[PDB]
Amino acid sequence: AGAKDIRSKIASVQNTQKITKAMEMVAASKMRKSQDRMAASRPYAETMRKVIGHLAHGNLEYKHPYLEDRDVKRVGYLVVSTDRGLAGGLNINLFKKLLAEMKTWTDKGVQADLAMIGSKGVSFFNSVGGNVVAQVTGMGDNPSLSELIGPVKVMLQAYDEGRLDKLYIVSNKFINTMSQVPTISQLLPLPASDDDDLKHKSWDYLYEPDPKALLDTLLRRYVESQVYQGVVENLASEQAARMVAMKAATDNGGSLIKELQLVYNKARQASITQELTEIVSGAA
Amino acid sequence: QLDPLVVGQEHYDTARGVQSILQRYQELKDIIAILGMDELSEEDKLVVARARKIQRFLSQPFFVAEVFTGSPGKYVSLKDTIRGFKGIMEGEYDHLPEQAFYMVGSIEEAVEKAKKL
Amino acid sequence: QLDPLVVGQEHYDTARGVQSILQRYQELKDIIAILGMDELSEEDKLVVARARKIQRFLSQPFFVAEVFTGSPGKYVSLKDTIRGFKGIMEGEYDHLPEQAFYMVGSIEEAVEKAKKL
Amino acid sequence: TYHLDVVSAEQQMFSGLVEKIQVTGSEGELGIYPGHAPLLTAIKPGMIRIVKQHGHEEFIYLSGGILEVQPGNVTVLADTAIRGQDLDEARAMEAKRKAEEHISSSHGDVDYAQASAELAKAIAQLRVIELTKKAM
Amino acid sequence: IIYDDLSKQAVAYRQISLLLRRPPGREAFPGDVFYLHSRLLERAARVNAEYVEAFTKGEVKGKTGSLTALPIIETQAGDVSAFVPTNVISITDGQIFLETNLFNAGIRPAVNPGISVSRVGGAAQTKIMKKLSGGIRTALAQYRELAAFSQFASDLDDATRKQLDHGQKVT
Amino acid sequence: TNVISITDGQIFLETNLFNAGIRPAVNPGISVSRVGGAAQTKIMKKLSGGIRTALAQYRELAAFSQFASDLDDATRKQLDHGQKVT
Secondary structure, three states, rough: HHHHHHHHHHHHHHHHHHHHHHHHHHHHHHHHHHHHHOOOOOHHHHHHHHHHHHHHOOOOOOOOOOOOOOOOEEEEEEEEOOOOOOOOOOOHHHHHHHHHHHHHHHOOEEEEEEEEEOHHHHHHHHHHHEEEEEEEEEOOOOOOHHHHHHHHHHHHHHHHHOOOEEEEEEEEEEEEOEEEEEEEEEEOOOOOOOOOOOOHHHHHOOEEEHHHHHHHHHHHHHHHHHHHHHHHHHHHHHHHHHHHHHHHHHHHHHHHHHHHHHHHHHHHHHHHHHHHHHOOOOOO | OOOOOHHHHHHHHHHHHHHHHHHHHOOOHHHHHHHHHHHHHOOOHHHHHHHHHHHHOOOOOOOHHHHHHOOOOOOHHHHHHHHHHHHHHHHHOOOOOOHHHOOOOOOHHHHHHHOOO | OOOOOHHHHHHHHHHHHHHHHHHHHHHHHHHHHHOOHHHHOOHHHHHHHHHHHHHHHOOOOOOOHHEEEEOOOOOOHHHHHHHHHHHHOOOOOHHHHHHHOOOOOOOOHHHHHHHHH | OOOEEEEEOOEEOOOEEEEEEEEEEOOOOOOOOEOOOOOEEOOOOOEEEEEEOOEEEEEEOOOOOEEEOOOOOEEEEEOOOOOOOOHHHHHOOOOOOHHHHHHHHHHHOOHHHHHHHHHHHHHHOHHHHHHHOOOO | OOOOHHHHHHHHHHHHHOOOOOOOOHHHHHHHHHHHHHHHHHOOOOEOOOHHHOOOOOOOOOOEEEEEOOOOOEEEOOOOHHHHHHHOOOOOOOOOOOOOHHHHOOOOEEEOOOOOOOOOHHHHHHHHHHHHHHHHHHHHHHHHHHHHHHHOOOOOOHHHHHHHHHHHHHO | OHHHHHHHHEEOOOOHHHHHHOOOOOOOOEEEOOHHHHHHHHHHHHHHHHHHHHHHHHHHHHHHHHHHHOOOHHHHHHHHHHHHOO
16 A cells, blocks of 8 residues: 555556557457458358269269268367457357357267367367367367368368268357357268259269269368368457456456555545644644 | 364365365456356366355255244254265266255255255 | 766666666566566567576676675776676576676676586 | 469459460369360469560469369469368378367457557456445 | 756755745745745746836837746656646746656757647747748647557558658658 | 664565465565574575565566466566565
């Protein structure tokens, strides 16, 4: 206490408020750039999914393991997590949703396997004893598809090897600048999602060399691309959450200054009084 | 009188554990105040969640305070309270809401109060 | 008295250079803590190495502290102080390990001490 | 002329109207003119020849992909690295390894690093909530 | 006229007051410490030609006299709110605040915009300077906070990078 | 402030360290002893020099303990050795 301590604390908290306001600005710009990069992904996935429309669930059928709803003995999850803190509750809400559903699954006796994107989930599930089979980390704010090839490759190789029976991606969904929602959504076996080619019965392709060889790589690339889309949306959601969290923290600091300055003024006055009564009642 | 040689090891050790938790909780209140509870480590969230229970369980209703609050007073024997605090600290009542501990007698009135919300 | 007109430009510039190096190393300590050394640039790792070597070389053994440490004291003339710090900042002695500079005295004693380490 | 799209999963690399293109398709070099019947094929890494309407040629380098053709649309779902069972298996092996040794690379965000460091140092031993009498 | 550190005249007055037992006031400065600097600085004035012609009994008739004063004050580690500095800030027509951070950083003279101000304003400024300088002050006042946002942000919008370059030029 | 000026050293006992469990609560970062190593047995004089530096590095790093999970193991080693010596 004493004026010269409380003024030092007020100074340090004002500095903290500078820091958090700068971080809010930075995050608010990075969110825009990240959602531009989020809308530069739709064409590839959408056209490729239209293609898989015609080739697979067309009037013509084909015998791919990744379109048939075989039996569930164990399930895989691709987990997207930030590489950086200060994100608000994002990661933990997501991990709690995941843990609740993975509990519901293991209550039928099925095992589960995790592939981790981002280091925060890596640490969390190393602590909670999850079954992490592969991971990639340090992508930061520059996610790239080439880095994702590893873990999704592992999960696919395990799926077609029979070792998995269903595959999920768990990630945040950027909806509004002010609201993002965690979602667990399936990507193997491929969902049934309209895209009817009954209209396109007018034509069929020249397949070089054959449709099955293509359909294989089509589906593999498509899964890779949906994982990438998920990573990029989660990145934009992280930026939005950091923006709102730093906003809240700047207003908290701004109120703590109001408290500290009342304490400071009280100490200022008490010190003046006690100095002056010590002088005056000294004389005589 | 709070010496192992006077109150016995278990009571002294429980008291010092409670103090350690509440102090560690004081050391976090500034970061919690600024950045909110979400920036804590996953083990600090547990320290906070246990301290906020210990604080309530230190509450008690008094026979001379029925005038103010209606609730009937309680008398808690020592043997019956070092057990309750040892329990909360060891995390075996770690599945019960905070308001389950507020204004109760022994740890068994808390486990009951939880059932009724 | 620390301005070019009185100390000479050689001295003034060597002093301001030491200040610049250390003032940058203060910036870099808190990157190294969060990210570890390897994420720095080539010149950032090099600024760090020279900053640590300068920070070491400012230590000295005293003939009167000779009684606390046992090590004999050293007297370093100003010519040699400027020559040493300028040699370190230019990168002449980048090939010696840091501990060659601790409590060394004159700069030649650094190139000598580096042998035995 | 017809409309050509060269898109990667990450980004888009070309659009607009073209007169012809020449593409080293899996089962043999190929060349597309307007009206071409519907076709579908992988392609090998290497250049692709574009001649834009008004005959302005330009090259592009593709690391692979799939070429697809419809009445008036042709598109090339390029991809960003050489894809092949030789390389993907190495990638997956590294990804498995890192799960065992329990490595984590640092992110490269130096600005978040510095901001968070200054924040951690500023907020330390602040002890404010003991000083302002706010209860909490 | 330039008074070097009225901060030390205040102290000499405090001493020569206490030694006469005169009852003290805040910070033990005598009661009338404000009326010490006031009755001094209020002599710096611009006096019109009729007061001159009266005082000098006609010997000079067209002129207006004046006496400008630049008092110096010595804060303790930037604490403008101390007793005497805030007495004097309330007496004078502005202040030139010399900032230690800029002075150590090599910005000499370390004049601090924003917090320093001249309350007569452009009325005192020759026309060309009133034209050319009209923007400098607040442009720099903004640059100094924009460049404080800078360090926590690489990858700056160049609409602001032009600004951070210009401010640095002028500084 | 007088007796701090008269004496040869100080042992500062802190109530926070005393609550947190650290007993005796001596605060090593502001306690001093101008006599210093000259008064120790030379075994202790040898061995305690490294404790001084271990705790000094711990006191410089401690600010990060509340963001620790974000830190780099090259510093995590020090930040745990400090806690163990304490």
